[PDB]
Amino acid sequence: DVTIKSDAPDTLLLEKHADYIASYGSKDDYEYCMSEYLRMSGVYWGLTVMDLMGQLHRMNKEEILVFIKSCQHECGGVSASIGHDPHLLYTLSAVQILTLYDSIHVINVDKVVAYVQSLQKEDGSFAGDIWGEIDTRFSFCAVATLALLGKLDAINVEKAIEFVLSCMNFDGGFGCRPGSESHAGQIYCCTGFLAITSQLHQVNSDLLGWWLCERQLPSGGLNGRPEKLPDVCYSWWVLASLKIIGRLHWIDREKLRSFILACQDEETGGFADRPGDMVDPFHTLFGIAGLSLLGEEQIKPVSPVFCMPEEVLQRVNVQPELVS
């Protein structure tokens, strides 16, 4: 079960992609308005890919800093958009943007810390928000937020680690919660988490690495779990996860690059889900990131853990050791 691939693009089109992201959001558009519930993360994706392509300056810094500030609530969490509700997901994204722009002081950093700390449970897990949903995704959002802010000690780190290790499975992988099946997305979040907290020694790298490299299909794309179709975003999580645990060479890299490039729209710019499907900023980020992790020299090197330029992270003195 894979995509048979047609006569798709085989060339890197930085050009169109930048044009696509600088113009995305000009305001009557349909999928734009339907996406308001994730706008903050939408803005993170746009800013990051542009910066990785060296075109951050074509985006509107001052405008975004107001927006962010207007999305922090009295609890200190940040929402996706104005009037929407605070959540760990949009708090991480705002901090990534503020770190991209060197402007963390645009929000009340003490209140962000308190907010993240208030979402931790007795067993070490994190809820996403006051409504209580538990997911190792939110373990990743909490520790990644705090690390960017230098405040990782604000949470109970040992109980947080314990919970994540309790979500490890027979195949080496990780799920949402205890007992949940392994999935590429959850693996990325958990290996990221273990990276930030210096616990990669607890991962069975050979076992998990095998599971991850078996995600690559004969088309060259990676899927997020068995029996699934490959795509660009699961291609980024799998690869990033492999890089974190020192096993990126267990994939056929030239076949992955080609899949990723077959995913560009030659006419509109941006990347899609999979070849010839409709483009979006989410897959545009993760395609450019994927290509950067495979080595492409037109793209700035990208952190597998934080999905941001390394040169940004070198500046804030946060750079987790990975396996080899």
């Binding site: 349909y30 308005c33 339907m34 308001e36 519930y37 994730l38 929402s79 996706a80 009037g83 929407h84 509700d85 959540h87 409504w131 209580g132 949903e133 997911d135 499975n169 027979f170 195949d171 799920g175 949402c176 919660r177 007992g179 949940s180 099946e181 392994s182 999935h183 050979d206 690495g209 095998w210 599971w211 490299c213 078996e214 690559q216 004969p218 779990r225 068995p226 029996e227 096993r247 060479h249 267990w250 994939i251 056929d252 076949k255």
Partner: protein
């Protein structure tokens, strides 16, 4: 035509969204908000803030209404949730809403929730949200790991796409025998698994589970386990004869020989890696690293000599 139906919905979406927020800042936690959110959440259950609003109105209304009236309110929430789940079965917010709802009631019907799960799992045997919902309900109803196990068996024989079901067995077996895998249990699981992979040799899911089982138990090899593994080895070669492009039975042959006797089977193991790399060239780097790790183990074993 294309633009006709497209624009038309987007007007009515923006009006509804607009009115809900207006209502909310105005403090109007009433049935009008459930009606407006009903409209938006059906098309887009990933709009989390609106699940929040619904909880907010229900919490409030419970304090202005008779238990009968709020009973009625939760039953309509349950039906609303199911109609949303039919449309988009994989939305985190919809499934989280349902647990919030059920966790809160005086006397939920958990047997009927387990059956909602059996229904969605017959639609989509791989749906991870439904499997997580099922484990949640099993817990709340204090369902024994023994019957969850009987349920997993049914799902595997009746049809394939079983990764989800073997995974659940990986977690249920250890619960049947609390330790800080018994050989009898292990031998049983080995027989079920090889069954499965000599039935659909291209189902990758039983092979993954199998490799775990090969680990899960040396030579403390009993004659029975010794004879069972030797038999599994001969069966994989026969399957190899039939399916020469089958990469999974080739790895398993290697892994089985490791489990049996690394040094006795050194030549064959080496033979099998070249064959395997030729059928699965995308894993050539993985296979070289595995073969290097094993040749190193073979070096340590040969040293322990006289």
């Amino acid at each position: 035509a294309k633009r006709l139906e497209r624009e038309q919905k987007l007007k009515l979406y923006q009006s509804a969204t607009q009115a809900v927020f207006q209502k909310r800042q105005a403090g109007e936690l009433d049935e009008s908000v459930l009606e407006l959110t009903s409209q938006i959440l059906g098309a887009n259950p990933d709009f989390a803030t609106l699940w929040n609003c619904r909880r907010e109105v229900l919490q409030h209304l419970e304090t202005e209404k008779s238990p009968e009236e709020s009973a009625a309110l939760v039953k309509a929430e349950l039906g609303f949730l199911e109609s949303c789940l039919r449309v988009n079965p994989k939305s985190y917010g919809t499934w989280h809403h349902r647990c919030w709802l059920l966790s809160r009631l005086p006397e939920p019907n958990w047997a009927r929730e387990l059956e909602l799960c059996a229904r969605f799992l017959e639609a989509d045997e791989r749906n991870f949200h439904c499997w997580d919902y099922r484990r949640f309900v099993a817990a709340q109803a204090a369902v024994a790991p023994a019957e969850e196990l009987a349920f997993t068996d049914s799902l595997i024989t009746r049809n394939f796409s079983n990764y989800s079901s073997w995974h659940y067995r990986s977690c249920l077996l250890p619960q049947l025998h609390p330790q800080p895998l018994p050989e009898n249990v292990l031998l049983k699981e080995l027989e079920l698994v090889q069954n499965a992979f000599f039935t659909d040799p291209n189902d990758q899911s039983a092979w993954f589970y199998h490799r775990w089982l090969l680990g899960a138990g040396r030579c403390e090899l009993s004659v029975e386990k010794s004879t069972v593994l030797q038999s599994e080895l001969e069966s994989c070669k026969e399957l190899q004869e039939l399916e020469p492009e089958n990469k999974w039975c080739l790895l398993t042959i290697i892994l089985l020989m490791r489990a049996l006797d690394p040094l006795l089977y050194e030549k064959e193991t080496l033979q099998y890696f070249s064959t395997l790399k030729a059928v699965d060239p995308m894993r050539a780097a993985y296979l070289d690293d595995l073969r290097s790790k094993f040749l190193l183990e073979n070096s340590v074993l040969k040293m322990e000599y006289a």
